[PDB]
């Protein structure tokens, strides 16, 4: 995969959004370290600019969201424990910066 820029869709349970994923699943990736950069994350800025009730942002097929699960993490740096997700948590000002989109 490679850092890329996509147009995300929103989910919520405004009607530009779709209903939420019925089976959100978080897949960890063994080993696997990714660099996150808060200062150059074009997902995150389009996200908060677009912003009960939560709104999730989601990737179309061909892209995936990596999530940082590290306990050190503050938006920028190597992340040692990473997950791939199809959508963010429900957002109700990051973070938020624990996410980046990549292309498969």
């Amino acid at each position, epitope marked *: 995969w490679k850092d890329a820029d*996509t147009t*995300l*869709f929103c989910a919520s349970d405004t009607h*530009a959004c779709v*209903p939420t994923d019925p089976n959100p699943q978080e897949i960890h990736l063994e080993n696997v370290t990714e660099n996150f950069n808060m200062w150059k994350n074009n997902m995150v800025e389009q996200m908060q600019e677009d912003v009960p009730i939560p709104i999730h942002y989601c990737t179309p097929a*061909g892209y995936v969201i990596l999530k940082c699960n590290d306990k050190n993490f503050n938006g920028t740096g190597p992340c040692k424990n990473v997950s791939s997700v199809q959508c963010t948590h429900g957002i109700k000002r990051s973070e938020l910066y624990k996410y980046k989109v990549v292309q498969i």
Partner: antibody
Amino acid sequence: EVQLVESGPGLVKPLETLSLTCAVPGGSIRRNYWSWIRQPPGKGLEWIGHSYGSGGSTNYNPSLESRVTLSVDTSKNLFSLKLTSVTAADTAVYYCARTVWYYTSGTHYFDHWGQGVLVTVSS
Amino acid sequence: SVLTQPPSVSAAPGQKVTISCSGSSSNIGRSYVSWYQQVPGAAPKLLIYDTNKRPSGVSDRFSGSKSGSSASLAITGLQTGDEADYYCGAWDGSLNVHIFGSGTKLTVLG
């Protein structure tokens, strides 16, 4: 209510190309999937294909794939369908629909539909 | 190439009915099922998504489920407003298509 209005010729000659247009909400075209679906009079539904509003992601019904092209014109908020070499079997009401797809979960459905347009194929 | 539904389902007003939808493990077996309600001459509308979830405006007289490679739509308190053609649908993860069912006309017996 997401308003979708399909357009095109009511009548097309056999072996010509059918072209249809679906007009969409601006604040949504780029950030959703959109499908075409058809229904010959008195018969059932058939999914034609879908296309993400920005991708880079198009999926066609495998049986119509050779004849089908879908396009998104974000500027004029048009979702379009071209279908080549039409026959008597392509007479149908054609619908555009906003599509919800979470590929990793296996859910794919149509939550807002336009009103449909009849295309009759006759020489 | 369609998921199999009965052509006709009917009952007197106020009765309960069910509509079956059978397919195979590459569709209903592995994917979520949706149901659509169509008055002839009008577009379908979404009735059920994610197998058993109702969109706004759909009453709880309508419920969906699935078992193995068959799905089912149960309707209680049958009434005039429910008379329509009903279609199930589901993604096929092997063929990569949305496959619709063959359609069922629901009649309230008058």
